[model samples]
Target: MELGAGGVVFNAKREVLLLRDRMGFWVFPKGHPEPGESLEEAAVREVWEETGVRAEVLLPLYPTRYVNPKGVEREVHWFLMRGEGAPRLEEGMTGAGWFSPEEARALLAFPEDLGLLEVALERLPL
Candidate 1:
């Protein structure tokens, strides 16, 4: 499995943050963990990298396991994060937005993203 770390971020307005990947699908920010970083480190870094928001860990919600398009299995550690500021994505990638729980459920591009958001909403203080 390709080890990755991801984050479910909620800002001051309680909006869920999502990223538009190269494939143009909506996804939570996630990437391979770097050397000397724990999964949590990678998790928060990904959130900031994709959305320009520094996020604090609110809760460790769940881990997502799935097969990638290349038929490789991957595992992503998920965190419920408290983030702030607006989205300012990096070069060549330009699609980050914060949405309400109602909107996020419909906007997320994958079932796992949706499933985790549902679980995260239940655990958040919202």
Candidate 2:
């Protein structure tokens, strides 16, 4: 199984950051860790690499397991993060935007990802 890490990042306004990928799917920024990188470090780096937004991990959300379109089994470690600065699209990303939790839920390409968003919401202060 492939290991991945990512962040469900929110700005000071509490808006979630969503990225539109090359495939046109709206998703979180995530990627495989570099050699000798911890999951937390990987998550932070991936967020920056894909979105150009600096982020700090607030808490771990939940891990998800699924098979990719290539039929490869993958496990992803997700973190709830606070982000800073405007997002500048990176290589694999086509666009970036901030959205409220409700809007993010509707915009997400995969239903399974909603569970991650829900977990983040539960931890966030009202």
Candidate 3:
């Protein structure tokens, strides 16, 4: 199984963040760990690397387990995050934007993401 980390990022306005990947699917920022970085560190760093938005981890969310198109089983540890600054897309991403939880739900590319989003929305700070 492959391991990954990502964040459900929220701005002060409570809008969520979304990015369109190179494959033309909307997603949250996440990636495999680099070297010895902990999952929390990887999650925060992945968000920054993809969106140019600095964020702090607020809490852990339910992890997502799924198989990728490549047929590799993957488990992604997710965190709730508070973000600062506007997002700028990385070269690996095709687009970036802030959206409300409702908007994000409609835009997400996979059903697996919906469950994670739900947990984030419920626990997010007002």
Candidate 4:
């Protein structure tokens, strides 16, 4: 199984950050943890690297497990994070931006991701 971490990051304006990967699917920023890195640290680093948004994690979200198109079993730990700064699309990302929760819900490419966001929203002020 592949282990990963990600964040549902929101700015002060309450807009959520979303990224488009090279495959053109809209997704939250996430990646595998490096050696010796904590899951939260890995989530934060991945968010910053992919979206250029600095964030502090507020709480954990429901973890998800699924098989990728490549048939690899993957497990991802997600967090709800408060973020600051404008997003800049970085390597491995095709685009990045902040959007209202409704807009993000419509734009996200996967049902699993949207479900995670819904759970996080219930816990956030937004």
Task: Show where candidate 3 strays beyond 4 Å.
Answer: none
lDDT of 2 at 10: 93
What is the per-residue lDDT of model 4 for residues 1-126, given as tens digits with 9 covering 90 to 100? 999999999888988999999999999998999999999999999888778889989999978999999999999999999998889988777888999989998999988888888888888774
State model 3's lDDT: 0.91
Ranking by lDDT: 3, 2, 4, 1
Tell me the whole-model lDDT of each prediction, alpha carbons only.
0.85, 0.91, 0.91, 0.90
Can you list the residue pairs that collide in candidate 4? Answer: none
- TM-score for all predictions? 0.90, 0.94, 0.94, 0.93
Candidate 1, residue 71: lDDT = 100
* Per-residue alpha-carbon lDDT of candidate 1 for residues 1-126, written as tens digits (9 for 90 to 100): 788888899987889988887777888888889988999999888777767889988889888788988999998899998888788766666588889999888878887677899888888886
Flag regions of model 4 displaced more than 4 Å. Answer: none
Tens digit of lDDT per residue, candidate 3, span 97-121? 9998889989999898898888999
Runs of candidate 2 exceeding 4 Å displacement: none
lDDT of 2 by residue, 12-92 (tens): 898999999998899998999988999999999999988999999988888899999999999999999999789987887
**Model 4: which ten-residue window has the lowest total lDDT?**
117-126
**CA deviation > 4 Å runs, candidate 1:** none
